[PDB]
Scaffold this active site. Structure first.
Site, PDB file in Angstrom:
ATOM      1  CG  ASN A 180      -2.042  -1.018   1.124  1.00 56.92           C
ATOM      2  OD1 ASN A 180      -2.649  -1.393   2.127  1.00 56.92           O
ATOM      3  ND2 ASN A 180      -2.326  -1.465  -0.091  1.00 56.92           N
ATOM      4  CG  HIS A 230      -4.431  -7.327   4.931  1.00 55.14           C
ATOM      5  ND1 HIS A 230      -5.274  -7.975   4.057  1.00 55.14           N
ATOM      6  CD2 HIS A 230      -4.222  -6.094   4.408  1.00 55.14           C
ATOM      7  CE1 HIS A 230      -5.570  -7.169   3.051  1.00 55.14           C
ATOM      8  NE2 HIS A 230      -4.944  -6.022   3.243  1.00 55.14           N
ATOM      9  CE1 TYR A 239      -3.200  -7.898   0.373  1.00 54.89           C
ATOM     10  CE2 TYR A 239      -2.841  -5.562  -0.012  1.00 54.89           C
ATOM     11  CZ  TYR A 239      -3.703  -6.629   0.145  1.00 54.89           C
ATOM     12  OH  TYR A 239      -5.063  -6.427   0.044  1.00 54.89           O
ATOM     13  NE  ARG A 293      -8.900  -9.794  -1.014  1.00 59.53           N
ATOM     14  CZ  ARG A 293      -8.072  -8.780  -0.770  1.00 59.53           C
ATOM     15  NH1 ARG A 293      -7.118  -8.893   0.142  1.00 59.53           N
ATOM     16  NH2 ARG A 293      -8.189  -7.649  -1.453  1.00 59.53           N
TER      17      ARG A 293
HETATM   18  C1  LIG Z   1      -2.512  -7.487  -3.016  1.00 58.50           C
HETATM   19  C2  LIG Z   1      -3.983  -7.412  -3.333  1.00 58.50           C
HETATM   20  O1  LIG Z   1      -4.753  -8.433  -3.362  1.00 58.50           O
HETATM   21  N1  LIG Z   1      -4.428  -6.063  -3.611  1.00 58.50           N
HETATM   22  C3  LIG Z   1      -5.901  -5.833  -3.966  1.00 58.50           C
HETATM   23  C4  LIG Z   1      -6.009  -5.453  -5.471  1.00 58.50           C
HETATM   24  O2  LIG Z   1      -5.383  -6.515  -6.231  1.00 58.50           O
HETATM   25  C5  LIG Z   1      -4.185  -6.259  -6.924  1.00 58.50           C
HETATM   26  O3  LIG Z   1      -4.524  -5.284  -8.095  1.00 58.50           O
HETATM   27  C6  LIG Z   1      -3.341  -4.856  -8.989  1.00 58.50           C
HETATM   28  C7  LIG Z   1      -3.453  -3.484  -9.630  1.00 58.50           C
HETATM   29  O4  LIG Z   1      -2.476  -3.066 -10.370  1.00 58.50           O
HETATM   30  O5  LIG Z   1      -4.562  -2.918  -9.317  1.00 58.50           O
HETATM   31  C8  LIG Z   1      -2.273  -5.718  -9.117  1.00 58.50           C
HETATM   32  C9  LIG Z   1      -2.366  -7.090  -8.384  1.00 58.50           C
HETATM   33  O6  LIG Z   1      -2.036  -8.305  -9.101  1.00 58.50           O
HETATM   34  C10 LIG Z   1      -3.705  -7.493  -7.621  1.00 58.50           C
HETATM   35  O7  LIG Z   1      -3.373  -8.500  -6.606  1.00 58.50           O
HETATM   36  C11 LIG Z   1      -7.536  -5.248  -5.897  1.00 58.50           C
HETATM   37  O8  LIG Z   1      -8.136  -6.506  -5.757  1.00 58.50           O
HETATM   38  C12 LIG Z   1      -8.144  -4.131  -5.030  1.00 58.50           C
HETATM   39  C13 LIG Z   1      -9.623  -3.896  -5.367  1.00 58.50           C
HETATM   40  O9  LIG Z   1     -10.562  -5.070  -5.713  1.00 58.50           O
HETATM   41  S1  LIG Z   1     -11.419  -5.704  -6.734  1.00 58.50           S
HETATM   42  O10 LIG Z   1     -12.490  -4.763  -7.137  1.00 58.50           O
HETATM   43  O11 LIG Z   1     -12.023  -6.940  -6.172  1.00 58.50           O
HETATM   44  O12 LIG Z   1     -10.590  -6.050  -7.916  1.00 58.50           O
HETATM   45  O13 LIG Z   1      -7.982  -4.478  -3.538  1.00 58.50           O
HETATM   46  C14 LIG Z   1      -6.534  -4.692  -3.124  1.00 58.50           C
HETATM   47  O14 LIG Z   1      -6.457  -5.002  -1.750  1.00 58.50           O
END
Ligand SMILES: CC(=O)N[C@@H]1[C@@H](O[C@@H]2OC(C(=O)O)=C[C@H](O)[C@H]2O)[C@@H](O)[C@@H](COS(=O)(=O)O)O[C@H]1O
Length: 722
Positions: A180, A230, A239, A293
């Site tokens: 993050n 988390h 992450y 997840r």
């Molecule tokens: C680490 C993780 O799971 N982060 C979540 C987001 O997922 C990542 O998105 C991207 C990117 O460039 O946006 C790269 C990564 O491969 C992927 O793991 C995403 O899931 C957001 C929002 O959610 S969604 O609407 O369900 O797609 O939440 C983060 O925590």
């Protein structure tokens, strides 16, 4: 206005898209271009061109669902990439240019602005969308005025004014760290460049530097390689991915601003790569036990996820020098070339990334040698990763304790990961596709491999829990030998078991004792649930006699061994039961859909055939004991079990030990401080985990107390006889 800020944005554009490196005669690049052409084409033919529209794209119309905002803006970013790509059919296309400008304005007036409040997921409002907006404006900065750019980025400053915290406009903000915190950079550093705001840039870079500090508690990287996010979840593979993937993109830009990061501060990056990431990569696959997840996402299976780490590593190698650069290149090269299942280019989404990978793979000066053996005890996140280079197999042990959460189910993702850390094990062999091709939505969640559980029904709405006990850990002796235990208690405190593992170079012994059940449900340990390949069928042997498995469960009493024979020995799996045991087996086609385990995924039915092996536990005080022996042919397995005839030293409620006579190594787990005499050669005196090797009259000791997370002086836990 063209200045140092735009210079940096030019470098950023070369990183996030790389149009300047495009070459139509380059097949891999032309392939990515065509993908983007198709995406833009689809977006352009489905966008609303009606006055008074209530949405831009019908499939991302409900703006109360934050995910629709990010998806919408990302569509504009794709357009910005092609309008600035000389080889795109949309290069400088008047309709695409006006579409991006008009779309930005529309969303700004009716959906996303400073006068709005987070509705749905904060992530989209603060990370997903801001990043899409920054990249769009950065790529098309020659089509927007500085005032328009500041106008369209104000909203970003409203939702993310503080570079040290997220959810700042909510009633529960949080301290930004790890992945993050890196995304905080891809938000405020870029917005800062777009807004020509030196303070925003300097303060954001300063905040980012926290990422380089190893921690001893909380979220972040630990000295032993673990990565927590988390609060208490092992998360190197998701992450952690975002962290290295995003940071490798930013660094080239950050190091050219007026606030470059000290070199000695970034030195920890190399520690993450070697200590944290590399061990989790086997044959191009990123171990699922570290991806939280994300395992429930169809587009992010093991080999795909691995590329996020590999491309990050490759970028870091590119900004490094000499030997450091040389070895990182070699690491990426050897991993990629060992992957005969997934095409790395399928997840290299920018031309510079494709270019880097191509030069690396064709450069004879970069060594590509098979990786050597290793064993990482990630005690701070309760996971253990083992790889045998001589035999070619990987082994992952997924646990949890009072210090870590068993599984993460949030945002409706990973609804059935209930038992993925209950002593679950992973075997990485010749079948690189094993945990891919729909493994997760088709695997029976009630029988995760290695786990001891009752058959009570579980609710998808359930969430993770920490373990009552702190007695969970691994004692590592060397690169091939280690011992681990888990003072297990199931989710509802109705079942217990002292589960231990003895990693002995080319095999792993699984011992379980003190198995008790206070419920009315049936208890059993899943020895394995292996996903099969229709092209490479297994010939099954029980006690070395061919058996015919059916969808219906068959019982095999008095079993001494089970052998799964493939035409490829690197896919063979043998199970030797120290003491004849009663087990049941079946081979059955299992169906499911990704949506079952992840709400936002496809409901399309998927299917895979699985071979399940189980051992029921009908009485209190029950136990199990067997040796997993992979990658050897049938005759060699039969010879090995004869050598191991007396390898089991003990398996009861206070002591569990396995002895490898060929190596002269002992794996020992003690649950109390009584004096334990082992093989009439030595004594171990304290509660804990041991891995011991005899070298002549000498004894090398590796002791670990999982509850205090400390080793101890030899004389406190070991005593040679006579
Ligand atoms: C680490 C993780 O799971 N982060 C979540 C987001 O997922 C990542 O998105 C991207 C990117 O460039 O946006 C790269 C990564 O491969 C992927 O793991 C995403 O899931 C957001 C929002 O959610 S969604 O609407 O369900 O797609 O939440 C983060 O925590």
């Amino acid at each position: 206005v063209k200045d140092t800020y735009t210079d940096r944005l030019d470098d950023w554009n070369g990183i996030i898209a790389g149009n300047q490196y495009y070459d139509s005669k380059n097949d891999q690049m032309a392939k990515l271009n065509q993908e983007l052409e198709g995406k833009v084409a689809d977006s352009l033919s489905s966008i609303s061109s009606q006055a008074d529209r209530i949405y831009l794209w019908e499939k991302f119309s409900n703006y109360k669902t934050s995910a629709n905002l990010t998806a919408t803006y990302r569509k504009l970013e794709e357009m910005a990439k092609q309008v600035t790509n000389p080889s795109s059919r949309y290069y400088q296309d008047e309709t695409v240019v006006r579409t991006v400008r008009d779309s930005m304005e529309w969303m700004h007036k009716h959906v996303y602005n400073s006068e709005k409040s987070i509705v749905g997921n904060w992530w989209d409002y603060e990370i997903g969308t801001p990043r899409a907006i920054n990249n769009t404006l950065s790529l098309m900065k020659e089509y927007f005025s500085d005032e328009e750019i500041k106008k369209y980025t104000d909203v970003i400053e409203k939702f993310v004014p503080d570079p040290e915290h997220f959810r700042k406009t909510t009633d529960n903000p949080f301290k930004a760290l790890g992945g993050n915190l890196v995304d905080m950079g891809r938000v405020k550093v870029i917005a800062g460049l777009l807004r020509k705001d030196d303070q925003e840039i300097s303060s954001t870079i300063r905040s980012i530097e926290q990422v380089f500090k190893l921690v001893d508690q909380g979220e972040g990287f630990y000295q032993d390689g673990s990565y927590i996010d988390h609060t208490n979840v092992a998360y190197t593979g998701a992450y952690g991915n975002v962290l290295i993937d995003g940071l490798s993109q930013l660094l080239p830009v950050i190091q050219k601003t007026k606030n470059p990061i000290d070199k000695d501060k970034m030195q920890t990056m190399y520690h993450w790569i070697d200590k944290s990431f590399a061990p989790l990569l086997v044959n191009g696959e990123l171990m699922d036990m570290s991806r939280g997840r994300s395992i429930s996402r169809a587009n992010s299976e093991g080999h795909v996820a691995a590329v996020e780490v590999l491309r990050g590593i490759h970028r870091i190698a590119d900004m490094s020098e000499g030997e450091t650069k040389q070895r990182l290149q070699s690491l990426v090269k050897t991993i990629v070339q060992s992957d005969s299942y997934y095409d790395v280019f399928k997840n290299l989404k920018t031309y510079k990334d494709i270019s880097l990978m191509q030069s690396l793979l064709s450069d004879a000066g970069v060594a590509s040698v098979p990786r050597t053996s290793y064993l990482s005890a990630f005690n701070k996140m309760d996971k253990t990763a083992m790889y045998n280079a001589e035999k070619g197999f990987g082994f992952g042990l997924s646990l949890f304790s009072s210090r870590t959460l068993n599984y993460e189910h949030m945002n409706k993702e990973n609804k059935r990961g209930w038992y993925t850390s209950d002593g679950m094990f992973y075997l990485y062999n010749g079948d690189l596709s094993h945990y891919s091709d729909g493994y997760w939505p088709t695997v029976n969640p009630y029988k995760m491999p290695g786990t001891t559980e009752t058959d009570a029904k579980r609710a998808d709405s359930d969430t993770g829990k920490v373990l009552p006990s702190a007695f969970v850990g691994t004692s590592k002796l060397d690169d091939a030998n280690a011992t681990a235990t888990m003072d297990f208690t199931n989710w509802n405190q109705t079942l217990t078991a002292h589960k231990s593992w003895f990693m002995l170079k080319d095999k792993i012994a699984f011992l379980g004792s003190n198995i008790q059940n206070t419920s009315t449900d049936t208890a059993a340990t899943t020895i394995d649930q292996r996903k099969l390949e229709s092209s490479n069928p297994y010939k099954v042997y029980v006690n070395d006699k061919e058996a015919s498995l059916t969808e219906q469960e068959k019982d095999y009493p008095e079993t001494q061994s089970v052998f799964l024979e493939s035409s490829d020995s690197k896919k063979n799996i043998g199970y030797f039961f120290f003491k004849k045991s009663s087990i049941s087996m079946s081979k059955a086609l299992q169906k499911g859909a990704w949506k079952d385990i992840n709400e936002g995924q496809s409901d399309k039915e998927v299917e895979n055939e699985f071979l399940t092996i189980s051992q029921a536990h009908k009485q209190n005080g029950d136990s199990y004991g067997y040796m997993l022996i992979p990658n050897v042919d049938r005759a060699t397995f039969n010879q090995m079990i004869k050598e191991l005839e007396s390898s089991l030293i003990e398996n009861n409620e206070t002591l569990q030990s396995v002895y490898d006579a060929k190596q002269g190594v002992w794996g020992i787990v003690k649950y109390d401080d009584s004096v334990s005499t082992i093989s009439n050669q030595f004594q171990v005196l304290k509660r804990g985990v041991y891995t011991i090797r005899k070298e002549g009259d000498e004894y090398k000791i590796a002791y670990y107390n999982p509850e205090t997370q400390e080793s101890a002086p030899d004389q406190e836990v070991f005593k040679k006889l006579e």
